[PDB]
Design a protein around this ligand. Structure first.
Ligand code: ATP
Ligand code: ATP
Ligand code: ATP
Ligand code: ATP
Ligand code: ATP
Ligand code: ADP
Ligand code: MG
Ligand code: MG
Ligand code: MG
Ligand code: MG
Ligand code: MG
Ligand code: MG
Lengths: 12, 303, 270, 303, 303, 303, 271
């Protein structure tokens, strides 16, 4: 029982 | 309403709106056999404000909270379904899967989005089938997500943003009221007990179920059937009727059932009722009931 | 039909579909043998709606739930396999470990996806071995995930959203029936006892699997309180009349008493 | 001022500004009944600095951080609302939903933006309801997000950057003070205990709430009502009054309610209260109270 | 020479430069009463190298790290502020919010830019408050961002490119030293335990706080105050002094508030402290101290 | 040869080029006091092919990939420095921050550019500190950037384009070898474990570090000092020597520092070490070592 | 678009040392299938690290006598929006133009993997472009083409892309006969003298050894003689069993038995 986060990525 | 939904992400709003329940087949109040005090209380809660908003405004407003508790099979979900149609307000069917998520902080945002969407559509009714799962007693050393969800529920129900003269109703059902959090238990002011059906309730259930299926039963037969069936819940009575209805089919000649027609089937008589009784037994032991009684004596609002 | 699958995670649907098993070798009721009342009840429940659906629809429809309680190695999985092969319906097999996951909230999503996918095809059978593990008595203190999974299962089986005509049958085989929660017990209306094979059943099984009358009768009489797995192993090693006696010369009944009491209280038998 | 907000992003500032509680109905100190010591302390904290900034500055500068604890439904959020109304300062209503986020490095930034925005508007009041969700005892194995949020909150409440003056008041309310972090407990210097209302508090509550109902009771009836209603929380008295006001409606015939005008309503009488007592019981068990008292002795600032 | 900042992006350089603390209120070692060994070692670390760099250069050079641990409110941040004021060198106040970033790869680049910038303003002091959030034990299933940040911090503190002879000092404060990574723990060579104030420390704090506010207190009264105030921390002593400062305000009548009469207020007396003792309680439970002692005996450097 | 760098943009090449570590202070193998086997292995790997390439080519060519694991502060970075100094080849000091970018699809580009530039200058040595950050076990759920970087590393180290005769060496140092991905483990054929120094290593370290400072130490005193320093790491001995070197300064009276001549300082005696031992403790807990041995016997390359 | 096509054209495999089928030895069935099909659009090769998949790729590049493309994640990923799909289209067009064409993908999981939360739009677009281009090229069958690749974690390959790769092959650890063949092939080049019993004992000692581990052991054995000498080639002592005994001191298996069951079950199911 554990949660996780996310990292954004830039694609211009 | 863009004003109060701008903050919320559109995806969460769509997920919440997906919880709207279709009306489905109508379920009238008379279909609910047995409980009367709870039925009258629910009527006063829901029907009365709709008809005369002017009279009940102010200090006579609806409580905005209900908690149905009783042993399995007594008909809590049936009452919820009946309210879903008779009330006429927007109905939300919320379960554990709807709110819980594996991403950090999404549970509280889902709760807030649910409450905001409910506030947009007024009047609205929110029904939680198993409230004990989400509103269990808070204890030390528990996952932070559950604590956040419980606190968010408490704040949304009785937070600073909450205002009077708002038509939102929350209804919850559970078989284990003793595990409900006290702080959350405070909001659910009206706590209704649904015990096992009485003799009159069983008679009414049997009569209603057998009315559709043509049969010839004398009054003494019904009385002795009621006497024999004791400590029987509504589900037990329904199963007994279902088993009895198949007696004529069982007595039909083997290999002819495939080619048989409904016209050739004989009516239902008392002969199959005893056979059904032989194959049906109560599903709720007497041991547990005492606990419920004590709770109904302590926190129950019944008379 | 994809409309009702709008809100489900596609990978969850893929996993649920992968959980389905392709049809195995054909099996028949006579092959397993050893049960008569159970065979009659199960066939009445399953076959009759298919052959003449028009008459059986309504108050006399299927009950949507079956439980099988008994000692280990008593042919429980055989009944489920026979139902899957003969019923001609999509068969779903679920174990205790399938629903469990490390991340929080995955069990409820798995249960919801399983039920929705099974609902996609109206005729289907969901067989859940070791039902007493995932569905167990809800104590005062326990893991949150287990409580969520149990409540989600109960809601899926019975709830406001659920509507008639589901035509989904849940079959659960257990060995510890007294650990089943009462709320879950209510759903499984038809509860059947699978006991050890009788003399005639044991004789039939041994004669069929092995492939004079006095020798067969003596062998049947000698073997007492032996489960199907024991017979299978004994015959397999024997094949590797004197040899049969040598193999014979090569479970406990004290606990079984409780089963009888349970079968007396909540069993569907007479 | 862009000088102090140049580090933050516009989205953070907009989200924080959305949390400002717009002025609502006015709630005065007379509405809150029974809590004399807490009311006096809050007055000394908030009102006195406004009147005379010069005398109360320096060593007499008002402390930052207040904690409220007690059994559920005893008037904590009511005190928060009263402070918001009478503080004459920008009011921020924060909750776990606003701060927590699913992206890495967001909770700390949200806390910093909140504190900076509150710093721009002075004086300011930050009210965190159900603080135990956010500030709990730190433990091994917890997700890094919670630890980072807690440490950022601590670094904002104190630290090298923090300086004197800069009027900012943080108020928290909770039902489980024993789980508050050791470090966070230091910041909340003033910790207050709000117990169940006493006889005088119950009398004041009933009189004030029933004055608007336009009824008539004799002094002996009020005394008996106060005496019978024992161990009732703040919300219990309100629920009793609400359910007592429906007595006249119940007495009236069901058919006439649709046609009856508001004028033809019997005034509330003691019989309604007697009926209400039969269906209303305390929602807080006396079992859980004892622990609070012990905490009040160990850490409470009361006399 | 700009070659130091050639690789780093200008925006990160600006963000780092924004972290330099201004010339806050002066603070000297005299104000920090209590611990004496810690002050002596800090002086040896910071003051001596600048007085005669030739003598202390080489093997006698100061270490590159310091750690401070103890219960809450024991003057760790006060020691950091005093070091910043007296060290006469650029002082960076870093925190978790200053380094974490949602975008992938910026977390370690922020640390690299910080160390590069601090390398140009030599001598420089980098102070990290609540360091346990940034350099906790490396878990088995932690997010990649945390692992990369910890690895970058370890590399910057000790690495091949350092080549020694860099006047960069890193200071950390925490309440949970047992959670610090061993690889990072070895970097902080000098670990200092700061216990609660002793009798002399409490007396000095009281004298310092009462010197500014004129009062007439005899030696016996001060001795009694010191005797009664047991287990109090520095924050507790400051809170007690602030509470006692309000005695004259409460003594006068309410109407005086409108007139104020600043000269009318009587000097603080011993009765004020007597009353203040009732409303002030120690904020640190003894049960938490044990662990610290063990750690101080296992990894501490205090004789 | 621009042909091998045809498809590399100049900006990528500049970042790789500027990371080359310039020749710092010299470091010799005898300067490293510790395990002889690792030193001999590294010498055979690096020095011997350079001296006699003709005989140590083809099959006998040096391998590509070395890993150094052990508890903190065991001289791994010192070995890296010595390799850089004595190899006489281009030395690249790579870290996590170097090869990570926020833009999509640039980490793999950075790795390709690094390997191409290294191939351009041969012989070359690539040193990665804390390799567990870049090459770690590929978890079930992770961002695409990390997986792409790991796969690019694996391809570059071993791939169809890769061929023998490339004088490029990759050296990694880590404290948590069990977390290295097995695919990455295969490339690093030579695994070297560097445990805590023994009595002989401690004696050598003390002699080397103390010979640079004038003093007189008796043989029995040196033996006793070595005996006392039990479980100390390589950095612990240096810290102990530094602490001892400060004793003479403390011996002199206050205010003498400003004007004391360098000559008028007492040399270091045994009492200095006796005092130092009080304030110096081992920085590595023994319980942490249990893992390393278990791994060393399972995948170690040492007899 | 000359510059864009230049990058694709510059990824063709260059001349290198020859590689022959007999060298692989261990995996006979996969070699048979590959040689039957080379002279089934998609072939996937999976197994524990160091099983010679890249060696198979190099052998195919050297023997097939056709254009060989070495494409990885770095080459097919660009920061500019929309250029990844265009570059994939250019790669497929160039492969079709020069026929026959062989495209080798090392670490396929990087390019395409099971769909997961938080995936960027660019990766999904590139994956869809790859799938559609492969289907379009394969359906017509007018132009010869072959696409193969390697990956150590086949369970992460998405089903949608998995169905395109009809051929799936598993390469287990080398067998005793394979180990002996590798030993003789690698050691026969250098002057050596050993008995058959010695080689049998070496094979028995080397258990659960991958090809890379065996190569490292052989290199250590060949290096041992230099260790023997104190501080011309004629001075080298012939390699004997003592060298192998010394090498076994510092050589250990690099592949744990933990995940072998996973590979075995996956191969049985879909292999
Ligand atoms: N009072 C009742 N009158 C008529 N039918 C009833 C009654 N109570 C239960 N039933 C029958 O029970 C079945 C549905 O029960 P329902 O789902 O409402 O039970 P429940 O109390 O909500 O159960 P659970 O505790 O498992 O959530 C239907 O057959 C309904 O006819
Ligand atoms: N001391 C009080 N005086 C007057 N009314 C009160 C008092 N306490 C509670 N009430 C009434 O109870 C209603 C709800 O109580 P309130 O929201 O203040 O409880 P609480 O202590 O914040 O509860 P919780 O612990 O659930 O957050 C208030 O609107 C007010 O009507
Ligand atoms: N040794 C001391 N001498 C005098 N005053 C002190 C001392 N220690 C603490 N104080 C007082 O306590 C106030 C707050 O303490 P401070 O902020 O330094 O605590 P801290 O060690 O940083 O706390 P934390 O462990 O909670 O991060 C200081 O402003 C000062 O007034
Ligand atoms: N074996 C050794 N011989 C001589 N000096 C040593 C040795 N080990 C450590 N030292 C001394 O300790 C100092 C710090 O050690 P160093 O930075 O090389 O450790 P490390 O192995 O790189 O550590 P980490 O595990 O933290 O990455 C070195 O500069 C050197 O002064
Ligand atoms: N079956 C084999 N026959 C001969 N050599 C082999 C074999 N398997 C591996 N090798 C040796 O392994 C090295 C090449 O391994 P290769 O790169 O093909 O492995 P891999 O499974 O693709 O590795 P990874 O997953 O680590 O990238 C060469 O030394 C080759 O000699
Ligand atoms: N009543 C039976 N008749 C024939 N075979 C049986 C019977 N019971 C068990 N078996 C044999 O035992 C094996 C395993 O039995 P299983 O289905 O696992 O029993 P259970 O479900 O009680 O664990 C099957 O392969 C089956 O052939
Ligand atoms: Mg229900
Ligand atoms: Mg089985
Ligand atoms: Mg509240
Ligand atoms: Mg501090
Ligand atoms: Mg190092
Ligand atoms: Mg490979």
């Amino acid at each position: 029982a554990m949660q996780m986060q996310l990292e954004a990525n830039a694609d211009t | 309403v863009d004003e109060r939904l701008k903050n919320l992400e559109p995806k969460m709003i769509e997920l919440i709106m997906n919880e709207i329940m279709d009306h489905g087949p109508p379920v009238n109040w008379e279909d609910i056999a047995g409980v009367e005090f709870a039925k009258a209380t629910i009527k006063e809660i829901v029907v009365w404000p709709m008809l005369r908003p002017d009279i009940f405004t102010g200090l006579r407003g609806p409580p905005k909270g209900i908690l149905l508790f009783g042993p399995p099979g007594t008909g809590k979900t049936l009452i919820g379904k009946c309210i879903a149609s008779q009330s006429g307000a927007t109905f939300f069917s919320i379960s554990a899967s709807s709110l819980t998520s594996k991403w950090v902080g999404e549970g509280e945002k889902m709760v807030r989005a649910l409450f905001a969407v409910a506030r947009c559509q007024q009047p609205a009714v929110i029904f939680i089938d198993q409230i004990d799962s989400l509103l269990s007693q808070r204890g030390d050393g528990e996952h932070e997500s559950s604590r956040r969800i419980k606190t968010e529920f408490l704040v949304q129900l009785d937070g600073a943003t909450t205002s009077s003269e708002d038509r939102i109703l929350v209804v919850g059902a559970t078989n284990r009221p003793q595990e409900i959090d006290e702080a959350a238990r405070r909001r659910l002011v009206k706590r209704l007990y649904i015990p096992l059906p009485e003799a009159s309730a069983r008679k009414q259930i049997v009569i209603n179920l057998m009315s559709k299926e043509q049969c010839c039963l004398s009054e003494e037969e019904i009385e002795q059937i009621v006497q024999q069936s004791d400590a029987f819940s509504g589900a037990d009575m329904t199963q007994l009727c279902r088993e009895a209805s198949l007696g004529p089919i069982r007595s039909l000649q083997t290999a002819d059932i495939a080619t048989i027609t409904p016209d050739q089937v004989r009516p239902i008589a008392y002969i199959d009722f005893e056979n059904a009784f032989r194959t049906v037994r109560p599903s709720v032991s007497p041991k547990d009931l005492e606990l419920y009684e004590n709770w109904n004596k302590t926190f129950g609002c019944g008379k």
